[PDB]
Amino acid sequence: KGGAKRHR
Amino acid sequence: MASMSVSTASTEMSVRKIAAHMKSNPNAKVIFMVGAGISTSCGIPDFRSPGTGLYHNLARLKLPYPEAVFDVDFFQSDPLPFYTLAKELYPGNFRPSKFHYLLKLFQDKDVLKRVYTQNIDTLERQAGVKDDLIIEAHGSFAHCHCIGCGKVYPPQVFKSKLAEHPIKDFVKCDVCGELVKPAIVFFGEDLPDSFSETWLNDSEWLREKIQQPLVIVVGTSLAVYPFASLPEEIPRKVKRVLCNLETVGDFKANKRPTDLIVHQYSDEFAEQLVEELGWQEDFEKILTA
Numbered sequence: 335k336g337g338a339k340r341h342r
Numbered sequence: 343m344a345s346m347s348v349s350t351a352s353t354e355m356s357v358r359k360i361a362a363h364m365k366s367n368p369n370a371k372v373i374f375m376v377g378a379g380i381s382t383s384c385g386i387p388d389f390r391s392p393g394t395g396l397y398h399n400l401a402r403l404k405l406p407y408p409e410a411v412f413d414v415d416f417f418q419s420d421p422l423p424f425y426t427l428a429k430e431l432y433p434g435n436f437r438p439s440k441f442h443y444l445l446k447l448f449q450d451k452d453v454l455k456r457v458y459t460q461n462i463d464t465l466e467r468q469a470g471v472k473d474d475l476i477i478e479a480h481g482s483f484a485h486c487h488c489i490g491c492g493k494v495y496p497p498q499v500f501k502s503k504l505a506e507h508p509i510k511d512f513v514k515c516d517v518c519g520e521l522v523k524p525a526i527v528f529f530g531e532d533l534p535d536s537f538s539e540t541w542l543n544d545s546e547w548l549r550e551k552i553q554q555p556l557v558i559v560v561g562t563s564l565a566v567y568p569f570a571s572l573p574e575e576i577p578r579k580v581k582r583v584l585c586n587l588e589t590v591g592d593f594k595a596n597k598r599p600t601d602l603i604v605h606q607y608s609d610e611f612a613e614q615l616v617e618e619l620g621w622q623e624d625f626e627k628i629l630t631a
């Protein structure tokens with residue numbers, strides 16, 4: 335699903 | 343709304359190609375993926391920029407660095423920074439750009455499949471894009487919830503707190519006692535389920551059409567995941583376009599032969615595109631109403 339909002 | 347070109351180089355010819363692909367595939371539709379670059383012309387203050395009043399108010403409140411305002415652990419220790427940002431950025435304080443009104447023209451001509459946005463300004467919706475065509479991948483202010491138990495609150499009770507001098511006694515849940523905040527996705531939370539569900543459907547739709555479709559990525563650094571995974575996930579045989587002052591993300595890292603790069607301001611790109619499509623008259627009506 336993409337995971338949690340983050341950088342990289 | 344007045345715009346100019348970014349440099350002496352003309353982008354009219356590159357933009358012309360986009361128009362010729364839509365003229366040659368007249369029942370086809372476009373998916374847009376957009377970020378904060380498309381709302382710069384609206385006067386929205388960038389919370390990471392020291393030239394803004396927002397930046398200096400957050401520093402004075404002892405925020406340690408800009409992005410902490412969107413950090414869960416930080417907000418729970420001290421909600422004041424986030425409440426002060428919400429007061430300045432709250433939807434309805436700004437008006438949509440010329441680029442925003444291009445999305446609304448595309449919808450009126452029935453050539454908008456979807457808009458995926460990482461902005462929290464809700465300016466696509468404010469401009470009249472329909473609810474079924476938008477994915478607000480980072481949430482918005484239009485809903486509020488308890489961070490502890492998930493209980494639902496109307497967004498007005500949060501909004502009414504922003505009008506107080508000084509802001510204090512933050513909204514707390516009447517069931518569990520924890521903080522209630524807008525349905526804005528913070529760093530370290532997952533995105534809403536509709537994001538992954540609609541991309542699954544739109545990824546299938548794109549493969550099936552290969553009326554050839556177009557995906558146009560506008561004003562985004564492609565630095566925040568999982569949003570920024572979308573352009574690598576576009577099918578190799580569906581033509582990608584990037585309208586962005588700089589070449590970024592998968593268009594820098596893994597360029598494709600058919601990738602088209604247009605280094606131009608979103609507003610100026612809009613005006614050129616409408617001219618190469620022949621839609622000047624219907625655009626001019628949207629802009630004056």
Ligand SMILES: Nc1ncnc2c1ncn2[C@@H]1O[C@H](COP(=O)(O)OP(=O)(O)OC[C@H]2NC[C@H](O)[C@@H]2O)[C@@H](O)[C@H]1O
Nearest residue numbers: 377378379382561562563564585586587588606607608
């Ligand atoms: N007028 C205009 N037209 C086209 N592209 C533009 C414009 N103005 C800026 N940009 C481009 O848009 C991109 C904006 O990047 P950014 O400021 O990082 O914002 P995002 O949409 O990608 O991200 C949001 C960020 N805001 C809060 C979180 O801190 C995120 O890192 C960047 O690559 C710029 O080259």
Ligand SMILES: [Zn+2]
Nearest residue numbers: 488491515518
């Ligand atoms: Zn609760």
